[PDB]
Amino acid sequence: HHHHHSRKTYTLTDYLKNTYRLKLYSLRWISDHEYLYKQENNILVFNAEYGNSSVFLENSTFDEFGHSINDYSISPDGQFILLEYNYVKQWRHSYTASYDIYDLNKRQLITEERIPNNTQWVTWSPVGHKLAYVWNNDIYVKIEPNLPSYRITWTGKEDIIYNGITDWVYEEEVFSAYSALWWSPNGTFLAYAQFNDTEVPLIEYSFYSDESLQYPKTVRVPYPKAGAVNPTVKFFVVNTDSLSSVTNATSIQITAPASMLIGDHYLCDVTWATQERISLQWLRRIQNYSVMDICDYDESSGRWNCLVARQHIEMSTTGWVGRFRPSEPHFTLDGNSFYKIISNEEGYRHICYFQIDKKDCTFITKGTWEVIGIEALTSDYLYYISNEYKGMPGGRNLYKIQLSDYTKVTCLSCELNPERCQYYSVSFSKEAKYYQLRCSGPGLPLYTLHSSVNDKGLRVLEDNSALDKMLQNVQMPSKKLDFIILNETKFWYQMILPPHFDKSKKYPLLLDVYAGPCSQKADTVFRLNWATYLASTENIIVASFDGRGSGYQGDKIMHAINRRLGTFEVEDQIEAARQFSKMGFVDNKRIAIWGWSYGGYVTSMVLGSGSGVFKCGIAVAPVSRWEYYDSVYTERYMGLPTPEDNLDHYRNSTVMSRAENFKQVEYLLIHGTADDNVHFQQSAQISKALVDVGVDFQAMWYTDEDHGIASSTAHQHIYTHMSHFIKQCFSLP
Amino acid sequence: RKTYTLTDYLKNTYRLKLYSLRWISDHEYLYKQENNILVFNAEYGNSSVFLENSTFDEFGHSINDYSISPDGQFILLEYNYVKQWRHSYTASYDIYDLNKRQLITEERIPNNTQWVTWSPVGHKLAYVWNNDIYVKIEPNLPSYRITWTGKEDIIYNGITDWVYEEEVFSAYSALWWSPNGTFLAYAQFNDTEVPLIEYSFYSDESLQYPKTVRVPYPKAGAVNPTVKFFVVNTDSLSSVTNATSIQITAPASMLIGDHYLCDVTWATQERISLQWLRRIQNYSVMDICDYDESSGRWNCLVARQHIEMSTTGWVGRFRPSEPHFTLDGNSFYKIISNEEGYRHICYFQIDKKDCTFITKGTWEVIGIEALTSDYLYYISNEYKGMPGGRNLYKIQLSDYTKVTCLSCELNPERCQYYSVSFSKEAKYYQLRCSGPGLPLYTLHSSVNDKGLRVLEDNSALDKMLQNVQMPSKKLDFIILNETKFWYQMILPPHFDKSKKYPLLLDVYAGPCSQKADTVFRLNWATYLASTENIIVASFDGRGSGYQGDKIMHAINRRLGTFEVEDQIEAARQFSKMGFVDNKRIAIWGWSYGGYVTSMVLGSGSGVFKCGIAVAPVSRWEYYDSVYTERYMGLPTPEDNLDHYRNSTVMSRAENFKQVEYLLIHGTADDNVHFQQSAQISKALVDVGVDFQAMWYTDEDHGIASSTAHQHIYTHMSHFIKQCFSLP
Ligand SMILES: *[C@@H]1O[C@H](CO)[C@@H](O[C@@H]2O[C@H](CO)[C@@H](O)[C@H](O)[C@H]2NC(C)=O)[C@H](O)[C@H]1NC(C)=O
Ligand SMILES: Cn1c(=O)cc(N2CCC[C@@H](N)C2)n(Cc2ccccc2C#N)c1=O
Ligand SMILES: Cn1c(=O)cc(N2CCC[C@@H](N)C2)n(Cc2ccccc2C#N)c1=O
């Protein structure tokens, strides 16, 4: 006699075997009215207005191909499909692959002049079917799919010269992409960055590979640690229409402004404005100063000209520029002005409207909230995501502002489903006539289609009802999203609360931490994760706290840890736990902390703080000292580890110096051996320091795993392993 | 009423006193009385301060070690010691003139010297620096450069490369002076095509970017170093012309393929013996090479080659034994296995193939220790048929049936494990008894074999151990298939056989291993037995040594089979003993023992709850050629590839679901590469096995840093205690 009461919990196996699956609705806009979607491996084309679909491309087309196709890409004109196979992952975004081109009209594979194996990047022009690809660090262009390539660059050299692709740090920390190729709107010009790593030092580490490898391999990666010599960058633009088979291509260099060339600098943004106008943003190595160049194409010269009167300066007195880099501009059609997120006089990030020839911009939004991103720009409206609604920094809604009247702002997503939907992102059609809304929480994910004409809902794309159905009799956790006042400042936290939560009880608590610069761990997003299992099955509250340094709440909070990582952010996680225990439903004796990456650093710094608050903790791929980590991320917040700059705090903020204090806690330290991002080195130095003061701890290396510890088997193993560690620390049987 | 704690073991609360002497002549030896160096008269037992503590107060450096020249005119002082591999290191050197009481300051031994050796008589000095050999006739005079080919990681003159150091000579030096020092013989190793093991070295926290260590290291079936052998006449060295080094080429039977130089032994002033081993180590040849005056060359008569081979295994225990030549060098004695497969002393004439065995029986000679004109002195395990006992015997050369046990009856209850140190001409010997009681060091005179005196009786420790509840040791055998197999147990204090104790099986089980013996040890096992009331057992199964080839060769070509099964069976036999908790049996080992532990835990026997593998081999292709191939042959389709593939711990990953595993490894292990454990962990992850792990940053095979040593044992103790439900 169960009486249909929910007696199921969300278990670890549920998480690891993916029993309860979030359905997505992933589309690709090809026009201003149609999109593509995979139904049952068939590519269906969808008419956005009527909802009717036809099979665009059947799954039973490339079976004869003889290869497993990883992905595809259709040319803007709908005439060719790029088939991506032999995918081999490199870093977070980089990979190599083989490519074939299928003629969608002739219905045949192109067999002449095929894109080579081991291609590093491939991209169609934004219109028609021109191809640019990078192979062996050089850029090639095909005007037609079956025609010989034109080689654009002749200088590419493995690990040294990168043409059209980023090196390690630029991929990870600047562009969040491997691509460094930018086609102009109508595909006339192909702009590209060239990176130079000649004197960048190499991180070297063992890769053991399949057990059949007799001798381990040494992987060597140009990787600049804090203060080390950085890659240099050049920028070019080539006219693809004046290419020739008898003469080499002329790439016109756009040099960085003089303000940048006087020291180490970065290219931090490339954005085409018009057919013949490009904007470049450059960044000083000390990342409080950036210059946007705006460069026009001179017809008679065939060259590019950045008038110093169109240079725009963005700088910060309180910190670095932008959230992680200076924001991207959104140009009006004539390219004579643009909209950009910058922080205002109060430190809040808002949309500023700039004329191309004017220093002072006007802010079109304002308030004690922040604009997250500019999503679309038409001649009448600008569409943007912000956390204004209900003054919740961890919410996200789409708004549109009338360009001719800034007092006329409408929220497009706010009232659609207020209880289920408080975290939206958006996908606009080619000229913003339609948009897909994607709501991520706090309810189950919800994908809907809309016409921007009168903002009416067209249809529900995915409502996750099959999962809703599965979860009916599961004892699921809830989320509490709220704030505490500390030094008259709101600080947000979330708690994943076990089912049938009772404030009379004392629960064990796991502090799930990131706490890196511009991090946000308290939000309205619905997640099915390890925290879900721990609350649902193990009755642990999993809490996260956004303290000083956290993002989306202004620079006063964000810039608070400037030049000072390993301080207030660490301090606020500890204080959070004090506050959490003070709420009366937390077991003071069973409070734990864990994090990955920056969160691993904070976990390690907290556990070594001597606070006495935390019983135990798990650091996964943590930073241990800032000199070990990459220059662009680290120097953004820390400056240079030189005696003239910030070496003292580089030295004061290592986890190693806190080793003695680990005698008070139970510690699990986890690192993948092939971690190219935070090097295994970092945890190897933690372990050695812990051994040297005689502190016992738990450790787990993951052979050949990288920063993600993302292999199917390793993912399952680490979470199983951490689960045992937490259950044991909490005396859970 | 106190027990022997982990801290006791870790902090060496209870020391075993040694009596380390180094003989200086046929009746004098040096002893390091703490700060001082004393010369002791072996005759009278009296001492004078040979070298004071504050003599080198003004030195300004920390002296690692000293070394007196044979004639006693000069002392070599060693400092700036930097360990390399197990035997190899670098050091700075000064020579101190004992006749004058001052440091030599001209033509000094360079910094970063790889090896130094005095000639056997007088004060000539040979040394190796930047892989080349230099000789100093006088300590203050310019050194003569012998070799000009030395090159880091590539050409090694007078020093060994990684594999020869670890697996062949158990030493860094490859320099051999003739008895009166006229000739300097040396080997030359060439690692040109030997592939490099590469691993990360993290170093001090201040190192921004890790270093890649790269070491020429042949894994099983890879390209080996090649070896050449040379002899130089140090008496006719010129300061004008280059030294002429006369090559002795390996025999024709060795030059046919890959081979090793495995032994160098001078017979006389002008006769050197060389032993060479084929890469397939079941065939070796001794060369007897004579100096020719009219030639200036060395001649090795083919009719003087002595072959030593094996049909059931490899040659020697770990390598063919060394010959002990008579004074004229026309005959020699060496240990070889007889027709029953037992290792015994055979007497050879230089010019004939047949030798005569001078010892016989179902026990083995461990080593020849000295030969005089009238007696041959050897150590063996004949006494009471105990392969784990060790005694010194003398065989009357004029009559082989006249064998006297010199140590058997000295203190039969306290002392069953002897080693010995004879004086220059064997006039005296020091006996070292390692157990079963507290170690006892005694001086004797060989003319009448009487005891001169007790040197160190370890009474200071005895008085301390009075207060502690100390564990006992049982050494005994079980019968498996009509064969004795020996085991030892470290039993908790006040052992009650009506009580059930958790058991930990301490394993080595490598070929020629012996873990059951009469030696007194203060170790981790001592603490586990004394404080934790855990029985710690070791078992010598098939593959184990000192019991003949039938047992030792049992695992030939078949590593990870019979010696794995025998540890399992031993544990089954220990459970049938009635005082063992069959719910709490664990297994652990280091190196080969890590391999066997892992193999046992992945066997699916169900016998073991848990275990710890420290720096284990995981598959034989990852380990060095010399050791691995000795037993496994080559990992090729036409040799032993199939068993190489069959004998991995990775292939057993699925069975680790039944046990609790701790896998431990130093990241800078040049010997058993971290790779080996990294492959185990990956295989366990791939089948969804949860286990426990620990890397030791920058630690090598020994995991021997004071702090790492303490951390590993503390970590293992918590693991065993948790496995055993011990609070
Ligand atoms: C061995 O090493 C030490 C240190 O490198 C040498 O001593 C130094 O010699 C240099 C010569 O350039 C002087 O500048 C220093 O005054 C010396 N410093 C120390 C620490 O003593 C030494 O000379 C080297 N060679 C030998 C054979 O002694
Ligand atoms: C938890 N988390 C994340 O989820 C994502 C992060 N980032 C933020 C910066 C851009 C990328 N490198 C990803 N970071 C920043 C970071 C700090 C220190 C060491 C490693 C990383 C990384 N990847 C991060 O900490
Ligand atoms: C326990 N133990 C020892 O105590 C000594 C060992 N040896 C025996 C052979 C000569 C040296 N390499 C030392 N070996 C052999 C060995 C087998 C497999 C992997 C590593 C080693 C090592 N050092 C050994 O296992």
Side-chain angles (χ1 to χ4, degrees), chain B residues 172-201:
Chain B
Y172 196 25
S173 56
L175 290 174
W176 301 272
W177 286 105
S178 68
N180 83 6
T182 291
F183 292 109
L184 187 64
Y186 68 95
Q188 176 191 79
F189 307 98
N190 181 341
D191 288 23
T192 300
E193 301 197 24
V194 180
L196 315 161
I197 182 64
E198 306 189 352
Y199 53 89
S200 286
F201 195 88

mmCIF file of all heavy atoms in Angstrom, chain B residues 172-201:
data_model
loop_
_atom_site.group_PDB
_atom_site.id
_atom_site.type_symbol
_atom_site.label_atom_id
_atom_site.label_comp_id
_atom_site.label_asym_id
_atom_site.label_seq_id
_atom_site.Cartn_x
_atom_site.Cartn_y
_atom_site.Cartn_z
ATOM 1 N N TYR B 172 77.151 2.052 -10.641
ATOM 2 C CA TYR B 172 77.381 3.072 -11.657
ATOM 3 C C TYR B 172 78.719 2.885 -12.366
ATOM 4 O O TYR B 172 78.835 3.190 -13.544
ATOM 5 C CB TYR B 172 77.336 4.452 -11.020
ATOM 6 C CG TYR B 172 77.189 5.625 -11.960
ATOM 7 C CD1 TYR B 172 76.593 5.481 -13.217
ATOM 8 C CD2 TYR B 172 77.625 6.904 -11.575
ATOM 9 C CE1 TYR B 172 76.433 6.573 -14.074
ATOM 10 C CE2 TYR B 172 77.471 8.000 -12.421
ATOM 11 C CZ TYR B 172 76.869 7.826 -13.666
ATOM 12 O OH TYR B 172 76.708 8.895 -14.513
ATOM 13 N N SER B 173 79.721 2.388 -11.646
ATOM 14 C CA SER B 173 81.053 2.265 -12.202
ATOM 15 C C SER B 173 81.162 1.102 -13.145
ATOM 16 O O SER B 173 80.545 0.052 -12.945
ATOM 17 C CB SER B 173 82.114 2.126 -11.111
ATOM 18 O OG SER B 173 81.843 1.039 -10.263
ATOM 19 N N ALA B 174 81.953 1.317 -14.186
ATOM 20 C CA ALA B 174 82.326 0.272 -15.118
ATOM 21 C C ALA B 174 83.820 0.446 -15.364
ATOM 22 O O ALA B 174 84.270 0.549 -16.507
ATOM 23 C CB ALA B 174 81.515 0.374 -16.414
ATOM 24 N N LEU B 175 84.562 0.513 -14.258
ATOM 25 C CA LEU B 175 86.021 0.610 -14.246
ATOM 26 C C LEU B 175 86.569 -0.504 -13.369
ATOM 27 O O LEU B 175 86.135 -0.670 -12.231
ATOM 28 C CB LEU B 175 86.498 1.954 -13.655
ATOM 29 C CG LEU B 175 86.303 3.282 -14.375
ATOM 30 C CD1 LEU B 175 86.747 4.429 -13.467
ATOM 31 C CD2 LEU B 175 87.099 3.310 -15.665
ATOM 32 N N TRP B 176 87.543 -1.238 -13.887
ATOM 33 C CA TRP B 176 88.139 -2.350 -13.153
ATOM 34 C C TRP B 176 89.661 -2.340 -13.226
ATOM 35 O O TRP B 176 90.248 -2.724 -14.238
ATOM 36 C CB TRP B 176 87.603 -3.677 -13.675
ATOM 37 C CG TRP B 176 86.121 -3.810 -13.575
ATOM 38 C CD1 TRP B 176 85.407 -4.290 -12.508
ATOM 39 C CD2 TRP B 176 85.166 -3.479 -14.582
ATOM 40 N NE1 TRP B 176 84.068 -4.270 -12.791
ATOM 41 C CE2 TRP B 176 83.889 -3.776 -14.059
ATOM 42 C CE3 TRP B 176 85.261 -2.959 -15.877
ATOM 43 C CZ2 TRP B 176 82.716 -3.579 -14.794
ATOM 44 C CZ3 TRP B 176 84.104 -2.761 -16.598
ATOM 45 C CH2 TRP B 176 82.844 -3.075 -16.058
ATOM 46 N N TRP B 177 90.284 -1.886 -12.143
ATOM 47 C CA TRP B 177 91.731 -1.895 -11.998
ATOM 48 C C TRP B 177 92.238 -3.333 -11.897
ATOM 49 O O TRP B 177 91.593 -4.177 -11.264
ATOM 50 C CB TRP B 177 92.133 -1.185 -10.707
ATOM 51 C CG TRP B 177 92.035 0.313 -10.674
ATOM 52 C CD1 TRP B 177 91.083 1.056 -10.037
ATOM 53 C CD2 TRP B 177 92.954 1.250 -11.254
ATOM 54 N NE1 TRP B 177 91.341 2.396 -10.198
ATOM 55 C CE2 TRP B 177 92.482 2.545 -10.939
ATOM 56 C CE3 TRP B 177 94.127 1.123 -12.008
ATOM 57 C CZ2 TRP B 177 93.137 3.702 -11.358
ATOM 58 C CZ3 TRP B 177 94.781 2.279 -12.425
ATOM 59 C CH2 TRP B 177 94.282 3.549 -12.098
ATOM 60 N N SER B 178 93.396 -3.607 -12.497
ATOM 61 C CA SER B 178 94.103 -4.863 -12.242
ATOM 62 C C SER B 178 94.615 -4.863 -10.789
ATOM 63 O O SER B 178 94.818 -3.794 -10.214
ATOM 64 C CB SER B 178 95.247 -5.052 -13.243
ATOM 65 O OG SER B 178 96.283 -4.109 -13.039
ATOM 66 N N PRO B 179 94.818 -6.058 -10.187
ATOM 67 C CA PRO B 179 95.165 -6.175 -8.757
ATOM 68 C C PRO B 179 96.267 -5.242 -8.230
ATOM 69 O O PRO B 179 96.134 -4.733 -7.113
ATOM 70 C CB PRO B 179 95.582 -7.641 -8.626
ATOM 71 C CG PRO B 179 94.740 -8.329 -9.655
ATOM 72 C CD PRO B 179 94.715 -7.386 -10.821
ATOM 73 N N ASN B 180 97.336 -5.023 -9.002
ATOM 74 C CA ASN B 180 98.384 -4.082 -8.589
ATOM 75 C C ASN B 180 98.241 -2.687 -9.207
ATOM 76 O O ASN B 180 99.091 -1.821 -9.008
ATOM 77 C CB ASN B 180 99.806 -4.664 -8.787
ATOM 78 C CG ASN B 180 100.331 -4.517 -10.216
ATOM 79 O OD1 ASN B 180 99.699 -3.890 -11.068
ATOM 80 N ND2 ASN B 180 101.499 -5.102 -10.478
ATOM 81 N N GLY B 181 97.173 -2.484 -9.972
ATOM 82 C CA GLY B 181 96.841 -1.168 -10.509
ATOM 83 C C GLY B 181 97.526 -0.747 -11.795
ATOM 84 O O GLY B 181 97.333 0.377 -12.243
ATOM 85 N N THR B 182 98.338 -1.627 -12.382
ATOM 86 C CA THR B 182 98.982 -1.354 -13.673
ATOM 87 C C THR B 182 97.945 -1.020 -14.759
ATOM 88 O O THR B 182 98.041 0.010 -15.434
ATOM 89 C CB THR B 182 99.838 -2.552 -14.134
ATOM 90 O OG1 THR B 182 100.975 -2.687 -13.276
ATOM 91 C CG2 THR B 182 100.317 -2.368 -15.569
ATOM 92 N N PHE B 183 96.948 -1.895 -14.897
ATOM 93 C CA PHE B 183 95.943 -1.785 -15.949
ATOM 94 C C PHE B 183 94.609 -1.241 -15.447
ATOM 95 O O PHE B 183 94.143 -1.600 -14.362
ATOM 96 C CB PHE B 183 95.710 -3.152 -16.611
ATOM 97 C CG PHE B 183 96.882 -3.661 -17.413
ATOM 98 C CD1 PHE B 183 97.636 -4.732 -16.954
ATOM 99 C CD2 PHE B 183 97.205 -3.090 -18.645
ATOM 100 C CE1 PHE B 183 98.698 -5.220 -17.696
ATOM 101 C CE2 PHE B 183 98.273 -3.567 -19.396
ATOM 102 C CZ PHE B 183 99.026 -4.633 -18.919
ATOM 103 N N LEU B 184 94.002 -0.376 -16.253
ATOM 104 C CA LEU B 184 92.609 0.018 -16.036
ATOM 105 C C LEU B 184 91.731 -0.534 -17.157
ATOM 106 O O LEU B 184 91.855 -0.132 -18.317
ATOM 107 C CB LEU B 184 92.460 1.539 -15.900
ATOM 108 C CG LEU B 184 91.075 2.074 -15.508
ATOM 109 C CD1 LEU B 184 90.646 1.615 -14.118
ATOM 110 C CD2 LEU B 184 91.098 3.584 -15.585
ATOM 111 N N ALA B 185 90.885 -1.491 -16.788
ATOM 112 C CA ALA B 185 89.898 -2.067 -17.686
ATOM 113 C C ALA B 185 88.583 -1.303 -17.560
ATOM 114 O O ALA B 185 88.176 -0.899 -16.459
ATOM 115 C CB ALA B 185 89.692 -3.550 -17.381
ATOM 116 N N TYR B 186 87.925 -1.080 -18.687
ATOM 117 C CA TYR B 186 86.639 -0.385 -18.656
ATOM 118 C C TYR B 186 85.671 -0.819 -19.754
ATOM 119 O O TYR B 186 86.083 -1.281 -20.821
ATOM 120 C CB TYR B 186 86.842 1.142 -18.667
ATOM 121 C CG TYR B 186 87.411 1.710 -19.945
ATOM 122 C CD1 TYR B 186 86.573 2.214 -20.939
ATOM 123 C CD2 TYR B 186 88.790 1.760 -20.156
ATOM 124 C CE1 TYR B 186 87.092 2.745 -22.121
ATOM 125 C CE2 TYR B 186 89.326 2.297 -21.336
ATOM 126 C CZ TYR B 186 88.470 2.791 -22.306
ATOM 127 O OH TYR B 186 88.985 3.314 -23.468
ATOM 128 N N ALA B 187 84.379 -0.668 -19.469
ATOM 129 C CA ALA B 187 83.354 -0.878 -20.473
ATOM 130 C C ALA B 187 82.907 0.466 -21.049
ATOM 131 O O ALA B 187 83.046 1.519 -20.409
ATOM 132 C CB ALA B 187 82.172 -1.634 -19.891
ATOM 133 N N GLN B 188 82.386 0.411 -22.270
ATOM 134 C CA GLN B 188 81.865 1.575 -22.946
ATOM 135 C C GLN B 188 80.494 1.220 -23.470
ATOM 136 O O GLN B 188 80.357 0.327 -24.302
ATOM 137 C CB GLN B 188 82.758 2.006 -24.115
ATOM 138 C CG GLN B 188 82.172 3.186 -24.917
ATOM 139 C CD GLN B 188 82.902 3.433 -26.221
ATOM 140 O OE1 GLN B 188 82.686 2.726 -27.206
ATOM 141 N NE2 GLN B 188 83.776 4.441 -26.235
ATOM 142 N N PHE B 189 79.494 1.940 -22.978
ATOM 143 C CA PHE B 189 78.107 1.762 -23.372
ATOM 144 C C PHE B 189 77.660 2.822 -24.353
ATOM 145 O O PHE B 189 78.048 3.984 -24.265
ATOM 146 C CB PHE B 189 77.214 1.756 -22.139
ATOM 147 C CG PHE B 189 77.662 0.767 -21.118
ATOM 148 C CD1 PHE B 189 78.429 1.170 -20.032
ATOM 149 C CD2 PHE B 189 77.371 -0.587 -21.276
ATOM 150 C CE1 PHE B 189 78.866 0.239 -19.093
ATOM 151 C CE2 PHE B 189 77.820 -1.524 -20.338
ATOM 152 C CZ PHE B 189 78.555 -1.101 -19.241
ATOM 153 N N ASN B 190 76.842 2.393 -25.298
ATOM 154 C CA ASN B 190 76.393 3.254 -26.351
ATOM 155 C C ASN B 190 74.878 3.197 -26.448
ATOM 156 O O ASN B 190 74.309 2.183 -26.857
ATOM 157 C CB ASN B 190 77.048 2.810 -27.642
ATOM 158 C CG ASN B 190 76.658 3.655 -28.812
ATOM 159 O OD1 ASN B 190 75.653 4.364 -28.799
ATOM 160 N ND2 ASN B 190 77.446 3.567 -29.857
ATOM 161 N N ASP B 191 74.236 4.298 -26.067
ATOM 162 C CA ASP B 191 72.779 4.359 -26.038
ATOM 163 C C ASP B 191 72.164 5.087 -27.220
ATOM 164 O O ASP B 191 71.014 5.504 -27.147
ATOM 165 C CB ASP B 191 72.298 4.996 -24.737
ATOM 166 C CG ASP B 191 72.485 4.090 -23.556
ATOM 167 O OD1 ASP B 191 73.341 3.190 -23.629
ATOM 168 O OD2 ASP B 191 71.780 4.273 -22.545
ATOM 169 N N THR B 192 72.913 5.212 -28.310
ATOM 170 C CA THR B 192 72.496 6.033 -29.450
ATOM 171 C C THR B 192 71.064 5.785 -29.921
ATOM 172 O O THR B 192 70.323 6.744 -30.182
ATOM 173 C CB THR B 192 73.469 5.903 -30.635
ATOM 174 O OG1 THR B 192 74.770 6.322 -30.215
ATOM 175 C CG2 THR B 192 73.041 6.784 -31.806
ATOM 176 N N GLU B 193 70.673 4.522 -30.037
ATOM 177 C CA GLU B 193 69.365 4.207 -30.620
ATOM 178 C C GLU B 193 68.364 3.658 -29.599
ATOM 179 O O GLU B 193 67.292 3.183 -29.965
ATOM 180 C CB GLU B 193 69.522 3.244 -31.796
ATOM 181 C CG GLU B 193 70.394 3.789 -32.902
ATOM 182 C CD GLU B 193 70.218 3.057 -34.202
ATOM 183 O OE1 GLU B 193 69.152 2.444 -34.404
ATOM 184 O OE2 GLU B 193 71.144 3.106 -35.035
ATOM 185 N N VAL B 194 68.746 3.727 -28.327
ATOM 186 C CA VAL B 194 67.898 3.350 -27.216
ATOM 187 C C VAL B 194 66.819 4.421 -27.036
ATOM 188 O O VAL B 194 67.130 5.600 -26.907
ATOM 189 C CB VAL B 194 68.731 3.182 -25.924
ATOM 190 C CG1 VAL B 194 67.856 2.782 -24.768
ATOM 191 C CG2 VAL B 194 69.843 2.151 -26.135
ATOM 192 N N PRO B 195 65.536 4.020 -27.072
ATOM 193 C CA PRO B 195 64.499 5.043 -26.950
ATOM 194 C C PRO B 195 64.451 5.622 -25.544
ATOM 195 O O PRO B 195 64.897 4.982 -24.583
ATOM 196 C CB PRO B 195 63.201 4.287 -27.273
ATOM 197 C CG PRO B 195 63.637 2.953 -27.859
ATOM 198 C CD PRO B 195 64.973 2.668 -27.237
ATOM 199 N N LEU B 196 63.913 6.830 -25.439
ATOM 200 C CA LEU B 196 63.905 7.565 -24.188
ATOM 201 C C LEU B 196 62.566 7.452 -23.495
ATOM 202 O O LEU B 196 61.518 7.704 -24.101
ATOM 203 C CB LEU B 196 64.194 9.055 -24.431
ATOM 204 C CG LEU B 196 65.327 9.472 -25.378
ATOM 205 C CD1 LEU B 196 65.118 10.921 -25.830
ATOM 206 C CD2 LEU B 196 66.695 9.269 -24.738
ATOM 207 N N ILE B 197 62.592 7.076 -22.226
ATOM 208 C CA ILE B 197 61.436 7.332 -21.387
ATOM 209 C C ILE B 197 61.436 8.824 -21.070
ATOM 210 O O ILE B 197 62.473 9.419 -20.730
ATOM 211 C CB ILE B 197 61.396 6.479 -20.097
ATOM 212 C CG1 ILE B 197 60.122 6.775 -19.281
ATOM 213 C CG2 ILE B 197 62.640 6.702 -19.219
ATOM 214 C CD1 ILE B 197 58.810 6.414 -19.970
ATOM 215 N N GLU B 198 60.270 9.422 -21.211
ATOM 216 C CA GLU B 198 60.087 10.821 -20.894
ATOM 217 C C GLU B 198 58.987 10.926 -19.871
ATOM 218 O O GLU B 198 57.953 10.251 -19.978
ATOM 219 C CB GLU B 198 59.745 11.611 -22.143
ATOM 220 C CG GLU B 198 60.764 11.397 -23.265
ATOM 221 C CD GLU B 198 60.573 12.333 -24.426
ATOM 222 O OE1 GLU B 198 59.571 13.060 -24.459
ATOM 223 O OE2 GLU B 198 61.444 12.364 -25.314
ATOM 224 N N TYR B 199 59.244 11.723 -18.843
ATOM 225 C CA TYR B 199 58.234 12.032 -17.855
ATOM 226 C C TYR B 199 58.420 13.443 -17.321
ATOM 227 O O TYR B 199 59.476 14.054 -17.505
ATOM 228 C CB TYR B 199 58.219 10.994 -16.734
ATOM 229 C CG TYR B 199 59.547 10.745 -16.062
ATOM 230 C CD1 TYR B 199 59.948 11.510 -14.964
ATOM 231 C CD2 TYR B 199 60.391 9.727 -16.504
ATOM 232 C CE1 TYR B 199 61.156 11.280 -14.340
ATOM 233 C CE2 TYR B 199 61.612 9.484 -15.880
ATOM 234 C CZ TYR B 199 61.981 10.259 -14.797
ATOM 235 O OH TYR B 199 63.178 10.020 -14.174
ATOM 236 N N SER B 200 57.368 13.964 -16.701
ATOM 237 C CA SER B 200 57.370 15.296 -16.132
ATOM 238 C C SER B 200 58.065 15.319 -14.776
ATOM 239 O O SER B 200 57.940 14.384 -13.986
ATOM 240 C CB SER B 200 55.937 15.802 -15.981
ATOM 241 O OG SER B 200 55.404 16.159 -17.237
ATOM 242 N N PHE B 201 58.813 16.392 -14.524
ATOM 243 C CA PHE B 201 59.381 16.639 -13.203
ATOM 244 C C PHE B 201 58.942 18.026 -12.770
ATOM 245 O O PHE B 201 59.198 19.017 -13.449
ATOM 246 C CB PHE B 201 60.915 16.490 -13.175
ATOM 247 C CG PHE B 201 61.480 16.380 -11.776
ATOM 248 C CD1 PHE B 201 61.582 15.135 -11.146
ATOM 249 C CD2 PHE B 201 61.883 17.522 -11.079
ATOM 250 C CE1 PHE B 201 62.093 15.027 -9.839
ATOM 251 C CE2 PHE B 201 62.388 17.426 -9.770
ATOM 252 C CZ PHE B 201 62.500 16.185 -9.152
#
